[PDB]
Ligand binder design. Structure first.
Ligand SMILES: NCc1ccc(-c2ncc(OCC3CCNCC3)nc2-c2ccc(-c3cn[nH]c3)cc2)cc1
Length: 164
């Protein structure tokens, strides 16, 4: 069994003094790490909202997560959407405007969390136009929350559904 733990990184809030363009228990953004022979390694990032943990399926792979002294366990997942919810139903209903700029709360493995302001690229799909946020970040950054101007989570770094 892989020893997967989550650790709180910071609060999830829109950053007003944020850098624009592209230079590339408790609510918040968590690092997802598993204990190794050398040490822990960061494999993903998750969003804690309303007592439910949200992360990418590929990061967790369905494995049980250790938070504090309690084991937090999966409730729902979608492999096609690469989404997994722990302890409760998916709580992230936020949608992108399609026109407004967004901030990515990044969590490079081994790096302070930072908010980066960028405009997502818009591409058509059979299921309706989608926004793509692609930057030069490590893999372990996967699951990093994408927030709108209201500070709601509109996407996970990996894919930004827009509703208008
Ligand atoms: N690992 C990155 C990744 C990115 C997007 C998707 C993805 N692929 C296909 C797809 O089809 C749209 C369906 C929606 C339900 N009707 C059937 C078509 N969707 C996605 C996707 C969309 C949104 C999100 C998402 C991220 N945060 N919140 C939702 C993740 C994956 C899968 C992996």
């Amino acid at each position: 069994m892989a020893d997967l733990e989550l650790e709180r990184a910071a609060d999830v809030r829109w950053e007003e003094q944020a850098e624009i363009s592209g230079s590339s228990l408790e609510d918040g953004a968590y690092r997802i790490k598993q204990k190794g022979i050398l040490g822990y390694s960061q494999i993903g990032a998750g969003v804690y909202k309303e007592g439910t943990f949200h992360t990418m399926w590929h990061v967790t792979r369905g494995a049980v997560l250790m938070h504090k002294g309690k084991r937090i366990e999966p409730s729902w997942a979608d492999v096609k959407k690469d989404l997994i919810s722990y302890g409760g139903g998916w709580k992230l209903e936020g949608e992108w405007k399609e026109g407004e700029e967004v901030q990515v709360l990044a969590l490079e493995p081994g790096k302070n969390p930072r908010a980066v302001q960028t405009k997502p690229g818009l591409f058509k799909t059979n299921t309706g136009t989608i926004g793509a946020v692609s930057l030069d970040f490590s893999p372990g950054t996967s699951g990093s929350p994408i927030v709108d101007k209201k500070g709601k989570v509109v996407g996970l770094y990996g894919i930004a559904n827009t509703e208008k």
